[PDB]
Structure formats: structure tokens, C-alpha cells
Design an enzyme around this catalytic site. Structure first.
Site, PDB file in Angstrom:
ATOM      1  N   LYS A  15       0.856  -1.174   0.000  1.00 41.90           N
ATOM      2  CA  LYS A  15       0.000   0.000   0.000  1.00 41.90           C
ATOM      3  C   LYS A  15       0.891   1.222   0.000  1.00 41.90           C
ATOM      4  CE  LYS A  15      -3.875  -0.070   2.634  1.00 41.90           C
ATOM      5  NZ  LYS A  15      -4.707  -0.504   3.765  1.00 41.90           N
ATOM      6  N   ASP A  30      10.353  -2.604 -17.535  1.00 45.70           N
ATOM      7  CA  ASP A  30       8.899  -2.532 -17.343  1.00 45.70           C
ATOM      8  C   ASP A  30       8.377  -1.127 -17.625  1.00 45.70           C
ATOM      9  OD1 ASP A  30       6.435  -3.764 -16.924  1.00 45.70           O
ATOM     10  OD2 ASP A  30       6.481  -3.413 -14.758  1.00 45.70           O
TER      11      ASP A  30
END
Ligand code: OT5
Ligand code: OT5
Lengths: 282, 286
Positions: free
Chosen positions: B29, B141
Site C-alpha cells: 500500500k 517494465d
């Protein structure tokens, strides 16, 4: 940014022995040394704390190089400020300055591809200064003694004492007229470096005919009169392809235009040098 | 690289208060926080130390970002691995991901020059990875969720967990990777090409529900260009706003990026220069 004691520097330089001296900086001497159990070769610059300008340039180098990281900048390993000393520690650049491989030297001439790769490396470093930090960094003192060569011949920009967010022959003439701080002043100085790589002569030779004293004025004048090829380094005669020669010459010409606003960005210079290297191959 | 104690992060986040949660997912988170007497706003990613790959990616981000410094890379302020935690602290990127300003969002559409400047900034960051570190760094990525935007809309490349020395990722994967070729920085070029087409078309890189020829944007957009109909799949907000010369330069650059064979693709420095040239071609004709 790593802190050295005076004793560590004294040890690294063998007590500042004369046989370790590599030359003189602006405010002191430069020594070959080794640190960390002799595993790391370093260069160590011993400055002058009794100079107001020397202090300012010392602090400016540390402020700049402690936050930058780039393959084509000489790394600041650390500094020492003990014992009323102002000492800077750099990675070792085994092949010294660009300039000492171009002229006034017993060193052999550099092949053209190697010269182009050195110019590309320096341009990558300058491009990083202009676009890769928080704010634009203007080096203010680009020249062939401030581009150093490591053991792999990789070119790296050094000497950040005059940087902001000079040297005769590299001074931007527009500065004395418009008095503006611009990264295009670095572009101008780098154009002189390009002509130095091509012509293998100093940026300023005060003994010459008036028209030849300044390389920044002389080389464009020759190119436009169709005789730049006559002032090229004799080693390079016949070794540069026509399309490479044209692209390199045009790029250097644009760098040294009178008016900073008409000069290319360093990213544009860098791309055109990479293009010139491709055209040397095709 | 700076070391944070667990007390510092607990304090910076008001004890991981849920009103400070910026995002939640398999990464962990992400929380909004403040450090140094409330002078530096940060984003704090609290990850899962039990995941093997989570630990690998944590260590890799720390490896890489501790040695790099570039305006167009998200800065790693520090980390914390006390109390069996695995926490990274970043400069705050107030405008979030580039993707959430392109589509599937309530955010207004981005003006064309602003999208070009965002692409240029990301290109500068990738160019730095490829030519500015000690050795070539392959991001591996690149995608629109890994380009973040700060309060001044400056674009910065994030997420080095998969990077190597040399947010759906299917639509960005270099096909030459499935042919077991040796991985290179040209795989970043390919993924970046897909980003360019997303910036132009404002649709996902991979939409598995479409007609088969439209599923992959990297295939569909070059196809439309060569058929003379790329302008029919451009973001509707952009219709009529791109000069012809800018449109051509941008589309040619993106199409070279997504060529099938990496050795035929441009370097990121070439891409960067052509994007700056595209912007000049937009500004000179207006
Ligand atoms: C010769 C050699 O092997 C070597 C190896 N590694 C280095 C690493 C860094 C620096 C350096 C020197 C100075 Cl004066 C600086 O101001 C800075 Cl910022 C770095 N110099 C060297 C260095 N030699 C120096 C010695 C001469 C100096 C300039 N002379 C006026 C021509 C510049 C080059
Ligand atoms: C929303 C907001 O204001 C904000 C502001 N500053 C940030 C600064 C850094 C990062 C960040 C987040 C993650 Cl998950 C990372 O892995 C990294 Cl390397 C950086 N995120 C934010 C950030 N939001 C995050 C939260 C969502 C997260 C998930 N992506 C969609 C996939 C990516 C973006």
C-alpha cells in the site's frame, strides 16, 4: 559525500611526495594516490584556503558533484577540510586531459573514431548538466583541459569550480555584450573543443596572424571559404568521410554562432555527433 | 541512502492512517506522508516482506536508485527494513500516473504539447538509464503506470524492481523476448514506443475484448498508419490539434520503436531527439 582525514590523504599520497605530483590546479597541486587498502586509484587536488576564490570554487565543486551521478562526469569521491586544508579526491583518469592527446605533446595522435567518441562522451556529460539536474547547470569553463580520459579512453567533464545554476579562447563573446547567463555559453565553448579535436591546435594562439588567433573565428571562416580541410590536423587528412566531415563541421559552426539563441542545444549537438559517427561508417 | 526508523514512518503517515492511502495492490500500500519537520512531502510504499519476489524487487530498487540522480527519475529518499518491515520513501508525485490522465479516468484530457513534454521527459530518463549510469540499465517494465507526474507535470520514470544491468505489462512486452533473444535496452525502446502510441490514441496498450487486429496497440497503430488511417484512432480530444509535420514525425518515431527486431529499433537518444524535433515542428507552424 565521503569525508577524509588529513592523515588519510597524507597516507594516500605518500606524504605529498614530489614523484606523485600530476600537475597544478587553480589553487594547488594534484597527486596520484591510492585509498582503501590500495584498491582504489585516486587523484587528489590540494588547494588554498587563504584564497577567497579558492574557497568559493572548493565549496562549489562539493555542492555540485555531491548530488550529480553520470558516466561522463569525473566522480568526486570525497574531500578533506581538516588542518586548514581544502582537498578534493577524484577518480583517477589514467589518460589525463583531452588536450595532451591533441597537440604540444609526445603522445601519439588519436584515430578519428576515437576522437569522435571522446567528443560524444563529453557532449553526453554536458547534456546531463543542462537537462538532468533539478535546475540547469552551466559549467562556464568547458575546454580541452577540463575533459579527462580514463584508462578505457572514456571522456569525462571535470572542474566545476566556476559552475552556476573563464579561459581565453573559449569565452562566449555574446556574454560581454548581452551579459546573460545561458547554457548556450557552454555550447559555444564546446564548439571550440570540437574544432580543437579536428584541427589539433590551441583555441587561442596570440602569435598568429590576426585572423587566425582565435580558432572560434578562424575555423568557420575557413569552412565558408572552402578551405577548412587545409587547417585540419595533418594526421586526419583523408581519414574523414565527406558526409562525416560536413556534419561535424556544420555542428561545430552552429555551436560558435555569435548569438546564443541561434546555437543548438547540447542534445542537438550530441545527436549530430552520433549521426556524424554513423556517417563515418556508411 | 537514507535509513528511516519505523517510528519515523509511523509518524510521517499518521500511523498508516487510511485517509492517507494513495493506492493499494499486490505491491503493498502507498501512503502520502511528510518528513523533516513537515518540510518534505513523500509517498511511502509499505510492501510485503514474506513475498520472495517482493524482497527481490525491494533490494533491486534500493541497489539502483541509491546510485542514480536524474531529474526524470523518481527519487528514492530512503528505506526502512526494521521491525520485519520493507518500506520505501519517494518524492511525492502529486499528479499520479501518466495513465490516469489518458483514459478510464475523470481527469481532464491533456493538451497535446503537455503530452509531448511528458514523453520527452520520460525519454530523457530512459536515455539516462541507457547512457548515464556506470553500465547500461534496462528498465524492463516501461509503461504508462510507471511514468509519474509531479506537481509541475514533470514526468519521471518509476519502479525499478525488475530492472537489470546490461499497470498491465502484456501490451508492452518486447515480442523478441519470446524468441529467447538476448535482452537489451532496445526492449525499453519497444515498450516506450507503445507508450507513445498510448499518448496519441488514449487507449490501453492491450485490449483483450476487441477485434483481433486491434487487441495490441503496438500492432494496430502501425497498421493504421501504413493504411493512411492513423488519424482515425487518435484521441478525439487531439483531432485537428497536431500539425501535419509534428504528426508525421511523432508517428514515424513510434513506429520505428515497435519494429519486430530490436537491432532495427532506434536508440533512446534518437527517439528523444526526434520527439524534441516533433515538438519544434508543432510550435513553428502552430
Ligand atoms: C595526469 C593524470 O593522470 C590525472 C588523472 N586523474 C585525474 C583526476 C582528476 C584530475 C583533476 C585535476 C584538476 Cl587540476 C581539477 O581541477 C580537477 Cl576538478 C580534476 N586530474 C587528474 C589527472 N591530472 C590533472 C593534472 C593537470 C590538470 C590541468 N593542467 C593545468 C593541465 C588536469 C589533469
Ligand atoms: C497517487 C499519488 O499521489 C502518488 C504520489 N506520489 C507517488 C510517488 C511514488 C509512487 C510510487 C508508487 C509505487 Cl506502487 C511504486 O512502486 C513506486 Cl516505485 C512509486 N506513487 C505515488 C503516488 N501514487 C501511486 C499509488 C498507485 C500505484 C499503483 N499504480 C497504479 C500501479 C502507483 C502510483
Amino acid at each position: 559525500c565521503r569525508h577524509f582525514s588529513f592523515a588519510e590523504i597524507k597516507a594516500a599520497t605518500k606524504n605529498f611526495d614530489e614523484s606523485r605530483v600530476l600537475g597544478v590546479g587553480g589553487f594547488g597541486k594534484v597527486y596520484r594516490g591510492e585509498i582503501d587498502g590500495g584498491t582504489t586509484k585516486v587523484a587528489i587536488k590540494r588547494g588554498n584556503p587563504m584564497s577567497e576564490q579558492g574557497v568559493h570554487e572548493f565549496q562549489t565543486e562539493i555542492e555540485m558533484l555531491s548530488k550529480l551521478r553520470h558516466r561522463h562526469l569525473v566522480s568526486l569521491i570525497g574531500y578533506c577540510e581538516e588542518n586548514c586544508e581544502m582537498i578534493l579526491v577524484y577518480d583517477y583518469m589514467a589518460h589525463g586531459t583531452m588536450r595532451e592527446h591533441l597537440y604540444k605533446t609526445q603522445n601519439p595522435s588519436l584515430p578519428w573514431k576515437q576522437r569522435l567518441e571522446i567528443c560524444i562522451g563529453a557532449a553526453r556529460g554536458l547534456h546531463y548538466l543542462h537537462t538532468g539536474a533539478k535546475h540547469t547547470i552551466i559549467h562556464r569553463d568547458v575546454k580541452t583541459t577540463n575533459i579527462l580520459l580514463d584508462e578505457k579512453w572514456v571522456a569525462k567533464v571535470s572542474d566545476f569550480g566556476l559552475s552556476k545554476t573563464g579561459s581565453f579562447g573559449y569565452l562566449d563573446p555574446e556574454y560581454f555584450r548581452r551579459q546573460q547567463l545561458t547554457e548556450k555559453s557552454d555550447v559555444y565553448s564546446f564548439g571550440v573543443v570540437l574544432f580543437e579535436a579536428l584541427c589539433a591546435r590551441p583555441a587561442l594562439n596570440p602569435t598568429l596572424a590576426k585572423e587566425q588567433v582565435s580558432l572560434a573565428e578562424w575555423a568557420p571562416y575557413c569552412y565558408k571559404k572552402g578551405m577548412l580541410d587545409q587547417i585540419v590536423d595533418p594526421y586526419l587528412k583523408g581519414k574523414i568521410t565527406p558526409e562525416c566531415f560536413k556534419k561535424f563541421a556544420e555542428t561545430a559552426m552552429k555551436c560558435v554562432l555569435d548569438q546564443g539563441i541561434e546555437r543548438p542545444s547540447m542534445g542537438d549537438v550530441l545527436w549530430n555527433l552520433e549521426f556524424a559517427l554513423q556517417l563515418q561508417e556508411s
